[PDB]
Amino acid sequence: SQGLLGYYFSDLNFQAPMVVTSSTTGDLSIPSSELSENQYFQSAIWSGFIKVSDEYTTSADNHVTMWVDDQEVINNKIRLEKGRLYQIKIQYQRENPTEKGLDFKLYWTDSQNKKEVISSDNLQLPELKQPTVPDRDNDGIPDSLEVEGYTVDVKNRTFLSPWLTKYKSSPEKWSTASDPYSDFEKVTGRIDKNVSPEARHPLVAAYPIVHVDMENIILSKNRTISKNTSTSRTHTAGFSNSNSSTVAIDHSLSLATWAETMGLNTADTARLNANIRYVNTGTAPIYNVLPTTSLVLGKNQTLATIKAKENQLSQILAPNNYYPSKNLAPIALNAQDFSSTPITMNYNQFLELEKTKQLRLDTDQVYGNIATYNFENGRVRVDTGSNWSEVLPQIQETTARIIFNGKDLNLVERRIAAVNPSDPLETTKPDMTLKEALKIAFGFNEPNGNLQYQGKDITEFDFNFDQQTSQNIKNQLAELNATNIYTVLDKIKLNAKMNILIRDKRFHYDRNNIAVGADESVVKEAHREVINSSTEGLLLNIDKDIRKILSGYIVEIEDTEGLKEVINDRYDMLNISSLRQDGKTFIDFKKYNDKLPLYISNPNYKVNVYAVTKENTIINPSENGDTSTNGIKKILIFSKKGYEI
């Protein structure tokens, strides 16, 4: 991944760089084919090192001053030894080249006086870590290019040129998002290949975000209860950077009371096992420390602490991915391990669990070491000297945060480099607009002068901010004499430490910003695409996001005077839908009608089907032990007479 590093300028004295690139060999040529009026380079500087056992003494020695260890070897047989790096610099100046590009080449000849063009094994890049071109942060991109904007073009080799994507970045910041990958590393691909594509932008932060997903649970007498669980990463807008997920435990029967199923009394004790995976929804991988997690009952009753053995991960935990991989078994809290700590609950705790059917997983931000690029060997490797713990707070202090749920209504967080007005040193950080932030961090695009996220217009999402950011953005709107944020997205300026929360408008949200319902019109409309209906059930085509907010359905026969009979008349029997492989929903009438189709004794009778949303879900008998669906808030989504079915 190596060779030297060249700057090619159109002016005579190195002030207006037009191409920045790296050659694998001593062939420092740029062919005009890889380039407009600006293709005549009047100067050029190359930097790097050379490696080797011998004495040794380019194509334009009358235009080239050169040094090997600030020791001019051109403008002379010098000695060099096996296993040592000699710093190299070459400068070049021709006024008025008649040709475009540069056919330039550097050679040495040995002691068997045999010449050669310097192999790709004797040339190394400068150490671009945190006769001179101005590069204050030593990332490799000249200050002028960072500020004015540049693009990168891939021929064969990356070519960096003044403004494909228009980049800008800070000439004062090795990594403009204060993360562990440099601006130059990101845009030339000298970076860990597991970093998310959008975090190869210098203004989008690369960092892990980890939470724990519980898939299922099993409670038992210390007679058992096994249930599936749904977990969501949460957010409560806030300014906290903690990781947390909430688990909802299936309250519906999976075989013909939790307290009645388990013979608990008072002095009894219950044990808990579960299956989990770690989930990385950030933009950078983790390699050798999984974070530690408290499993919490109620507000702050820690039932367990979940840990994985440091330095013995069986893999990467990559962005947009799971550990273990989904193709592998999940992690058991007490694995098939003598000395797994038992997870225990007293009677009171057990009833509290049954009351709420909820747990919380609080995960710390301890992510361990970083795989950084090494310029000495052009490889990416875990760097024991580099730790995420030192990086995360710098990222958090210099970026605006956008949390967005456009992807399956799951909360996804990105951080974007943005100016801090009070910081005297960030006169140099690129201005970041809200609109550009959504495009680069989340992939919004604008086909027809309308900002969209995968088919959904931006106005289908609501904008919410923390208190400081609200005041800031309100002030901006008035300054713009704008009334409406959607119309001035391109002019809203983002600052460091802003928090912005963007949520699909069709839904209702709990205080964790999980989608837990939708207004009745939304719900009814999502159920109008009926494919088939019969006395055995309904086949519908229902939007994925809609299904996510539904806990179940209630089926009901209504006679001609409107007397109603609820077929699945228990709060724990609403789980009669399933999602077929063609993506359609089947609502099964037989499942709790003793496996029989409905019996409609009169064709004029109605079959009504109601959806129940998450937030309206009853998860226990009432105070007096009522287990019926009486009282449950439900939404009519199908109603037809016997003779229409």
Nearer to Ca ion, 48 or 517 (CB): 48
Hey, what are 233's tokens?
């990463």
Tell me how far apart the alpha carbons of residues 638 and 636 are, in angstroms, rounded to a whole number.
6
Tell me how far apart the alpha carbons of residues 28 and 157 are, in angstroms, rounded to a whole number.
12
Residues that bind Ca ion (CB under 5 A): 135, 137, 139, 141, 169, 173, 183
Residue 214 parent element (H or E): strand 210-221
Nearer to Ca ion, 166 or 326 (CB): 166
* Structure-token match 């949200």, residue found: 509
Nearer to Ca ion, 50 or 133 (CB): 133
Nearer to Ca ion, 173 or 190 (CB): 173
Nearer to Ca ion, 137 or 556 (CB): 137
With contact defined as beta carbons under 8 Å apart, do 605 and 598 qualify?
A: no
Residue 475 parent element (H or E): helix 467-479
For the four alpha carbons of 247, 253, 258 and 261, in that order, the dihedral sign comes to negative
Nearer to Ca ion, 160 or 262 (CB): 160
Nearby residues of 112 by Cβ (< 8 Å), 6 or more positions away: none
The backbone torsions φ and ψ at residue 574, rounded to the nearest 5 degrees and listed phi first, read -90, 0
Residue 183 parent element (H or E): helix 183-188
* Cα angle 133, 138, 141; round to 5: 60
- Provide the minimum distance between the beta carbon of 440 and Ca ion in the complex, in angstroms, as a whole number: 16
Q: Is 466 annotated as a binding residue?
A: no
The backbone torsions φ and ψ at residue 197, rounded to the nearest 5 degrees and listed phi first, read -55, -40
Q: Is 543 annotated as a binding residue?
A: no
Nearer to Ca ion, 18 or 270 (CB): 18
Hey, what are 630's tokens?
């009486």
- Provide the minimum distance between the beta carbon of 130 and Ca ion in the complex, in angstroms, as a whole number: 10
Hey, what are 477's tokens?
């709107």
**For the residues of 87-107, what is the DSSP string, one character each?**
EEEEEEE-SS-SSSBB--B-E
- Provide the minimum distance between the beta carbon of 145 and Ca ion in the complex, in angstroms, as a whole number: 8
Nearer to Ca ion, 23 or 169 (CB): 169
Task: Say which DSSP state 582 is in.
Answer: T
With contact defined as beta carbons under 8 Å apart, do 202 and 429 qualify?
A: no
Nearby residues of 298 by Cβ (< 8 Å), 6 or more positions away: 352, 356
- Provide the minimum distance between the beta carbon of 41 and Ca ion in the complex, in angstroms, as a whole number: 20
Burial of 88 (0-12, 13-18, 19+ CB in 10 A): buried
Nearer to Ca ion, 136 or 407 (CB): 136
Closest residue to Ca ion, judged by C-beta, is: 183
Nearer to Ca ion, 137 or 354 (CB): 137
- Provide the minimum distance between the beta carbon of 106 and Ca ion in the complex, in angstroms, as a whole number: 24
**For the residues of 479-519, what is the DSSP string, one character each?**
HTT-S-GGGGGGGPEEBTT-EEEEEETTEEE-TT--EEEE-
- Provide the minimum distance between the beta carbon of 499 and Ca ion in the complex, in angstroms, as a whole number: 25
- Name which of 22, 20, 19 is nearest 1 in CA terms: 22
The backbone torsions φ and ψ at residue 248, rounded to the nearest 5 degrees and listed phi first, read -110, 125
With contact defined as beta carbons under 8 Å apart, do 323 and 278 qualify?
A: yes
- Provide the minimum distance between the beta carbon of 142 and Ca ion in the complex, in angstroms, as a whole number: 6
The backbone torsions φ and ψ at residue 433, rounded to the nearest 5 degrees and listed phi first, read -95, 160
- Provide the minimum distance between the beta carbon of 391 and Ca ion in the complex, in angstroms, as a whole number: 16
Q: Is 146 annotated as a binding residue?
A: yes
Nearer to Ca ion, 182 or 245 (CB): 182
Q: Is 183 annotated as a binding residue?
A: yes
Q: Is 175 annotated as a binding residue?
A: no
- Provide the minimum distance between the beta carbon of 13 and Ca ion in the complex, in angstroms, as a whole number: 19
Buried b vs exposed e over 377-412: b needs ≥16 C-beta within 10 Å? eeebeeeeeebbeebbebbbebbbbbbbbbbebebb
Q: Is 108 helix (H, G, I), strand (E, B) or coil?
A: strand
Q: Is 139 annotated as a binding residue?
A: yes
- Provide the minimum distance between the beta carbon of 30 and Ca ion in the complex, in angstroms, as a whole number: 21
CA distance to 441, 524, 559, per residue, from 610 (Å): 39, 9, 17
- Binning the chain into helix, strand and coil, the percentages to the nearest 5 are 15, 35, 50
* Structure-token match 């999602």, residue found: 579
- Provide the minimum distance between the beta carbon of 136 and Ca ion in the complex, in angstroms, as a whole number: 6
Q: Is 436 annotated as a binding residue?
A: no
Residue 272 parent element (H or E): strand 269-280
- Provide the minimum distance between the beta carbon of 367 and Ca ion in the complex, in angstroms, as a whole number: 24
Residue 304 parent element (H or E): strand 301-306
Q: Which amino acid is at 279?
A: V
Nearer to Ca ion, 198 or 250 (CB): 198
- Provide the minimum distance between the beta carbon of 239 and Ca ion in the complex, in angstroms, as a whole number: 27
Nearer to Ca ion, 147 or 332 (CB): 147
Q: Which amino acid is at 263?
A: G
- Provide the minimum distance between the beta carbon of 143 and Ca ion in the complex, in angstroms, as a whole number: 6
Nearer to Ca ion, 173 or 506 (CB): 173
Nearby residues of 328 by Cβ (< 8 Å), 6 or more positions away: none
Instruction: List, as residue ranges, the binding site.
Output: 135, 137, 139, 141, 146, 170, 173, 183
Instruction: List, as residue ranges, the binding site for Ca(2+).
Output: 135, 137, 139, 141, 146, 170, 173, 183
